[model samples]
Target: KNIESLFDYSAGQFEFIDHLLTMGVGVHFAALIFFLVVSQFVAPKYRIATALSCIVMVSAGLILNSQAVMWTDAYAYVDGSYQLQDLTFSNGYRYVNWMATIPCLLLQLLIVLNLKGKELFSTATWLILAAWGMIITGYVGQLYEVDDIAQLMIWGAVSTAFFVVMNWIVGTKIFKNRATMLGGTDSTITKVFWLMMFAWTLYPIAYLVPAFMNNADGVVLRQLLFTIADISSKVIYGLMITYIAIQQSAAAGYVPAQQALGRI
Candidate 1:
């Protein structure tokens, strides 16, 4: 069923959701610039993490911008409220965007962790595969968000299976690498991992919004959760990894990184 297509909203509701999406577009683009500017302070080898982060920002910014446009195009003022129009709208764009960016998001973690050889190859393969699997199944599940609860639940379960695999890998290999990394104690790496874990849980919650609250308010809440999750997982996570890289650089006696640490 067309979950988004099912709703009409009052002026306040329409403007609220519209403002959230518009703000998200700006945040992501701003994040791109922030990552780019700070990237220079990081070591040459660790720069790829910021590079990957920049890619995520651009991809998310464009997707959010398109969503903002799509939001306006998907509805029209009729009588007293804005109603769904001939052009359909769905959260499918977000799934498509995630498929493109999540791999980059996870790969950058590997680079920061400094894994090489078989360790790197295997983790990258599993993480990418599971990430895609999770998004694909979740996308399929969302297609039935309003029409078929049984189908949605089944596919959601399948997607969660992939998510579990990702968690397993993150818990094991990621933490295992963290122990050996400089500034990987309770301070940076641990906090980053927990932040990612917390932020990622919001996605599945957002996905299930249609199941319980398939209405205008639910739509707004779902979008808000998505925006928050995106900012946390991509932008904030990138900043933390950049901090790790800078600290790593300082430990390696990069003069600028060393001086940079003293000023902070």
Candidate 2:
């Protein structure tokens, strides 16, 4: 019984690690596609700026990954054990994984600052809050030394709430008006934009509900919840990035005409 229990626990940890790796890949690929699409649509000046920003984000992730590897290798060299906790920082992977928000935060800021005219204040305020909340949630998760899953669930709930609010503000206040003014009704691209918004809006609930239910001790349900959260968050994030890139591109191309029409 003891050996079987040990094997099961080991397997669970491995499963968790696998989930992390999967999430990392998903995020990286999603960001890459988003940047690629944005590059296709931006003005010459903005194109270089956006491209450089994307590169910087990617580089940051790579740097973090390298650091994680170094930390892990150092631990293994000293202890001769493959234990993740031996990594000196509560799973060295968290050190890198947590930094995943850096790019998202940067991009969020870029959009908020660059958005112009009457709607600027509303958009910027909400975006900033959203980004701030995300950063805070990440910090809380990393800095707080919680022993139980319930505490983690609470953190996740707080993060999810902030993220969902952010999405709501973007969809209703920012995009709704802009879409109307741009005569985006019935367009396929517009439809995709709304779909992306919906996905983002739903994502937090998907994560929060599972997290809350999974808080009980040693329940396999927690693992399943985490898996669901990982996949849903990744999918929503990818869709949002892709949608934003496409919209930005389209907007850039239309800018000249709008300027000629005195719409700018």
Candidate 3:
């Protein structure tokens, strides 16, 4: 409608985007259920965990909605193929999304994990910086795609270094501190952080998808893998937080019930 289409978007291309957009919007509501029933188990003081979890989720839906319009609505089955609809799609909106969500993810962890005083300030500062360091360097790598392997190699190496630092903080600092902080079997909380580390390892793999694979099938494969990864990372990350909230709440179940009853 507004811009001229260069290549024609085929059926399968739109199909892939539609499905991605569908799942993208779909997961947000599923995430909301976590937000909704959380209070049934989560108590007052730590309820911010539930609040942040929900906030992270609802924004994904909004993000995906924009992506749908951004990717799908931008394209058209032009002369022969879906031309480069909006230059922005090629610009890697995923990077844009990552920049916003990564900081939120770290904050969500800090809040749910219940950082206190100095731990709170330091954790917030370092984690925020770490999150940006990982994503911003990553976005830099993505920007290097058009130029040559040199930028990819350099920026990608820098991004990988940042990722390792993040892993070290989570592995050494967060894990060591969890047992003392959360008490009563830190296994669940500990396991969730480990799960996050595992999930995070997928990004670089997904980022390199096109280098190994290309064409109509190439775009679909890359986008599909990305959609799945995004869902897996954010949704699963939120669930892990929700899992801890419920578990912690369940540990104090009697108190929550009493509070619900207005006894305390």
- Top candidate on lDDT is 1
* Candidate 3 Cα RMSD after full superposition onto the native fold (Å): 4.3
TM-score of each: 0.96, 0.51, 0.84
Q: Please write out the lDDT profile of model 3 over residues 1-264, one tens digit for every residue.
A: 111122355877767776887787888778778667756656665677667767667777777777777776666677766666544455355676667777677766766666677987787788778868888887878665544656666788898898988777766666666765442537777777777776787778766654565345655666676666667778887877766665555466546634543542
The residue ranges of model 2 lying beyond 4 angstroms of the native Cα positions read 1-41, 44-60, 63-85, 89-114, 141-150, 153-160, 178-264
Ranking by lDDT: 1, 3, 2
Q: How many clashing pairs per prediction, in order? A: 0, 0, 8
* Over 4 Å off, model 1: 183-186
Off by over 4 Å in 3: 1-9, 85-88, 181-185, 257-264
Write the residue-wise lDDT of candidate 2 on 1-264 in tens digits. Answer: 001111122444444444554555556556656666656544443354345435534543454345444433433212432343422323223324424543443343234224445566566555666756764674454333234445556776777677667666655544444443222322443453465445444433433432343322222343344334433433444344434443444565656433433532
- Candidate 3 lDDT for residue 24: 78
- Best-performing candidate as measured by TM-score: 1
lDDT of 1: 0.85
Q: What tens digits encode model 1's per-residue C-alpha lDDT throughout 26-127? A: 888888888788777778877888889999989888988898999899899999999988887778888998999988878888887888889988999999
The residue-level lDDT of candidate 2 at 249 comes to 42
Cα lDDT computed for each candidate against the true fold: 0.85, 0.44, 0.67
For model 3, which pairs clash? 7-81, 7-82, 7-83, 8-78, 8-81, 8-82, 9-81, 9-82
Model 3 worst lDDT run, 10 consecutive residues: 1-10
Cand. 2 TM to true fold: 0.51
